[PDB]
Amino acid sequence: KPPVEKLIEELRQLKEKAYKGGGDERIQFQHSKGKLTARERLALLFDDGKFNEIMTFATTRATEFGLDKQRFYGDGVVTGWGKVDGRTVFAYAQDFTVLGGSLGETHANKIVRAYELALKVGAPVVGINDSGGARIQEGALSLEGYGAVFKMNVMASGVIPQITIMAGPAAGGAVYSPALTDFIIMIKGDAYYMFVTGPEITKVVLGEEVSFQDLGGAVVHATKSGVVHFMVDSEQEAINLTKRLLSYLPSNNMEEPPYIDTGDPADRDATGVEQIVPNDAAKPYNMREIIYKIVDNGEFLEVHKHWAQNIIVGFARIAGNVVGIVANNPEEFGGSIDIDAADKAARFIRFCDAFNIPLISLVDTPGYVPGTDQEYKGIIRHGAKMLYAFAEATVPKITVIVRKSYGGAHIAMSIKSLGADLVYAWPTAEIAVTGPEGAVRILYRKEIQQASNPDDVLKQRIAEYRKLFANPYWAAEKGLVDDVIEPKDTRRVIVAGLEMLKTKREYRYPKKHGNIPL
């Protein structure tokens, strides 16, 4: 083999073969088979004209079970880095056409190398999952592989943003790396499912055979389990959303979130946000409409939109700077916080704090969801997570009480003693040690029965308590709230608060970590 011009030609042939991921039948079975190929997903995700793929030809070293038979350059996963809206982002994309996107030892080591490079230079990692699980043929070595990926996920946790696009049939080990990341974007009709244990070990423990698509699918994890943060109906929408999610996040924990507008129409508001809240204190309203008039162009990327809807969590921008919002939702469970809600908010809060994203709390909550069901499932420890998340956080934190704020939930939404930097309240704010009714009863236990009607006093007591305490001015007089303000001022007020808090630095006791309730 002497010619060089001939060698460059053979290189082209080899790479052309490697790109097919084994199966010019399979990949060609790409543009009308339901899903896109690993490479096609990567083409959509990256600007593409400046980057590199690593370990392109790396193959499995296992021999057992005919693994010596096949080659498959890359061993089932494409790893490397690129540009997304001009920012460096690492990524891997498993190729289902190669042994069911099975996780081989080499396949795992490519994902790990990717994570190592990303960690070294402070770049986000996007995992486009499309794997059925462990590569059975490689035995315990496949489990070692998973273990190595997981360890990287934990090392990268809170250091670099980790986003996973669940675009395949994940089972067993395949579900845990995504769980360790910060956000899971899953397709409903273009990607399909994820579960620890398959229907097989249980289908002889009941009796219903669930064909294929979305069994323990997206709908289940996005509305019931809370494992999925965003559910989309397409792979194109899955990648588009990834880009949009990346745009609100910094590249690492050493950088401030991106300012992509940096425009400051913060000057002022005049879109009567006060009309949103009903004159009647018992009537609901869409809290999202309030965040719309507060944030730039009304934009808001909601996280966990279809899970634990009693609280709202998501990203937006104020004066061009990204903010994280945690707001009670009056349209679901009367705005009461839940076990799911508490979990939803707690993780969003810690994530925001880890990546230096200011936190804005919009409050209207009567308390927690009552019930032996909640207590039995441990609302006591799940609810404590929010208290921990806020207290732990050092990012700028501002609370705006729009309406109700009672008892423990009042505290969980972030108050001064818990570490709130600034607390504001609308004239409609109502802070109370507990629900007025609940407070009046105990506060007059013996009376209420020594008058002229066991129901009379619950007015001269319930309505009077609200007039003398169900207001923002009692807490304001005690210095618990910094100020009471006109609803239309909220944006200008948040703008000035964040601007001043911009260079906030606090203190924390040295520890390997804490022990938040799980």
Added chain:
Amino acid sequence: AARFIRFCDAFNIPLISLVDTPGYVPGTDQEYKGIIRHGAKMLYAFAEATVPKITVIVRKSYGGAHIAMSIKSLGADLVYAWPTAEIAVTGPEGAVRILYRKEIQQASNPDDVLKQRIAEYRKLFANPYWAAEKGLVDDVIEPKDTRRVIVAGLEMLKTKREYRYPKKHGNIPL
């Protein structure tokens, strides 16, 4: 286990894992209540931890649960296995099921093969020696030595120091 792990690590208490687990409890109830994110907490807790960590597999450790009890790639410092240890990518049956299709309904043999190949696989894989030959376990040991081994291991690891990436904190699943 996750919270116990994190608490011990935070207060410098060595961690000893004693393994015998087939995997996770199946069913919609578990999946619906998010076993995926809860299960991940153990993986995080162990990987996170820097105190001395030693694993002793007494019997089985299959699939994901095998990893969650702490393996070397996840950060275990030392891994030992009793002669009875049985480490597998998944339950041997579930494994054999897959690894022997294309020959389970095509072979001129009815259905007694699933039990034979299930037994061969266990004899061929369900043994500490395969993992030990791959460097996955440091050694296979005589049950009665478990104490001596943990003692030596802890004595040596007592001055252990690892290295962690600077961060305000992490984002373990909740």
